[PDB]
Design an enzyme around this catalytic site. Structure first.
Site, PDB file in Angstrom:
ATOM      1  N   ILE A   1       0.888  -1.206  -0.148  1.00 21.48           N
ATOM      2  CA  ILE A   1      -0.022  -0.054  -0.108  1.00 21.48           C
ATOM      3  C   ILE A   1       0.894   1.299   0.036  1.00 21.48           C
ATOM      4  O   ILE A   1       2.055   1.392   0.902  1.00 21.48           O
ATOM      5  CB  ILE A   1      -1.058  -0.099   1.254  1.00 21.48           C
ATOM      6  CG1 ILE A   1      -2.076  -1.158   1.245  1.00 21.48           C
ATOM      7  CG2 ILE A   1      -1.625   1.200   1.225  1.00 21.48           C
ATOM      8  CD1 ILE A   1      -2.897  -1.236   2.237  1.00 21.48           C
TER       9      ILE A   1
ATOM     10  N   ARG B   1      -2.583 -12.366  -0.335  1.00 17.01           N
ATOM     11  CA  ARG B   1      -1.144 -13.127  -0.541  1.00 17.01           C
ATOM     12  C   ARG B   1      -1.255 -14.711  -0.162  1.00 17.01           C
ATOM     13  O   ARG B   1      -0.772 -15.652  -0.680  1.00 17.01           O
ATOM     14  CB  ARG B   1       0.038 -12.565   0.161  1.00 17.01           C
ATOM     15  CG  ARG B   1       0.379 -11.188  -0.522  1.00 17.01           C
ATOM     16  CD  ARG B   1       1.234 -10.490   0.562  1.00 17.01           C
ATOM     17  NE  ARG B   1       2.040  -9.480  -0.135  1.00 17.01           N
ATOM     18  CZ  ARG B   1       2.244  -8.172   0.703  1.00 17.01           C
ATOM     19  NH1 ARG B   1       2.318  -8.518   2.085  1.00 17.01           N
ATOM     20  NH2 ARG B   1       2.792  -7.187   0.339  1.00 17.01           N
TER      21      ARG B   1
ATOM     22  N   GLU C   1      -2.272  -8.786   2.813  1.00 17.17           N
ATOM     23  CA  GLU C   1      -2.002 -10.217   3.055  1.00 17.17           C
ATOM     24  C   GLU C   1      -2.769 -11.158   3.068  1.00 17.17           C
ATOM     25  O   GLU C   1      -2.391 -12.379   2.665  1.00 17.17           O
ATOM     26  CB  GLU C   1      -1.505 -10.146   4.952  1.00 17.17           C
ATOM     27  CG  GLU C   1      -0.606  -9.176   5.171  1.00 17.17           C
ATOM     28  CD  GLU C   1       0.953  -9.301   4.904  1.00 17.17           C
ATOM     29  OE1 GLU C   1       1.114 -10.207   3.891  1.00 17.17           O
ATOM     30  OE2 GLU C   1       1.939  -8.794   5.241  1.00 17.17           O
TER      31      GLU C   1
END
Ligand SMILES: *[C@@H]1O[C@H](CO)[C@@H](O)[C@H](O)[C@H]1NC(C)=O
Length: 246
Positions: free
Chosen positions: A71, A163, A160
């Protein structure tokens, strides 16, 4: 762009958001069936815009670097905010230019600095969908200490989760009740660059990591990941950081 609304959100609609997020990140190749993020992207195309709406319908737009899911900054009404780091300053040349004013936050975006600013490690900050609503709300009006905590929630619940399937599932479990991340979640976050690198090095090494990655598992137990047959690789990781960026 991708969007997520907290109003009416449930595990299914959050899963749709995380899938949209992953699917917005460009790739040319998969490595062991995992999308390989690009070494680099020029200009404005580097940045994905995520439109997030709190339960009341107020919104921020978050800029995400598509090569590494980092970000960079966010827009809240007519004010832009960017991390105090060169990648974010460069992002600020391309996104949110129509903001009436630009604030540089007084920290970079890495977890160590954000935790310093927030006053607490992320082991101690509950995450979930209610926490994400709170974070969005916090970011709507500047408060740099509050914002550090909000940003630790926002990074975990968006980037996250994109991912790692396990992290997505953790947030789904917290659709209506926040809870601090599991030690496995923290381990995965911390290992993403290491894992991304070893999965790529395995391509010419018969699937075997050159260097084993140590992780905590779902039971608080500390494992060594040595090759691509591990469930972390076959099931969990969803995106690889290009080794050109490591
Ligand atoms: C590779 O990982 C598997 C699954 O985690 C493990 O059982 C095995 O002993 C490892 N094999 C090699 C060749 O490193």
């Amino acid at each position: 762009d991708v969007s997520f609304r907290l109003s009416g959100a449930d595990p299914s609609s959050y899963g749709m958001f995380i899938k949209d997020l992953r699917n917005a990140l460009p790739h040319t190749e998969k490595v062991y069936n995992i999308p390989l993020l690009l070494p680099s992207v020029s200009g404005a195309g580097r940045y994905l815009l995520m439109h997030l709406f709190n339960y009341d319908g107020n919104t921020i737009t978050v800029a995400v670097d598509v090569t590494n899911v980092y970000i960079m900054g966010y827009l809240a009404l007519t004010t832009s905010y960017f991390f105090n780091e060169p990648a974010a300053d460069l992002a600020s040349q391309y996104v949110f230019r129509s903001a009436r004013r630009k604030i540089t936050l007084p920290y970079s975006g890495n977890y160590e600095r954000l935790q310093i600013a927030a006053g607490k490690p992320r082991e101690k900050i509950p995450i979930g969908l209610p926490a994400l609503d709170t974070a969005i709300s916090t970011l709507l009006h500047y408060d740099s200490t509050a914002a550090a905590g909000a940003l630790l929630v926002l990074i975990q619940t968006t980037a996250e989760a994109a991912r790692f399937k396990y992290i997505e599932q953790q947030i789904q479990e917290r659709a209506y009740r926040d809870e601090v991340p599991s030690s496995a979640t923290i381990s995965l976050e911390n290992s993403w660059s290491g894992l991304s690198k070893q999965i790529q090095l395995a391509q010419g090494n018969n699937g075997v990591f050159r260097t084993p990655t140590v992780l905590v598992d779902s039971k608080g137990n500390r494992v060594q990941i040595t090759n691509v047959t591990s469930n972390v690789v076959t099931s969990n990781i969803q995106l690889l950081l290009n080794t050109k960026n490591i």
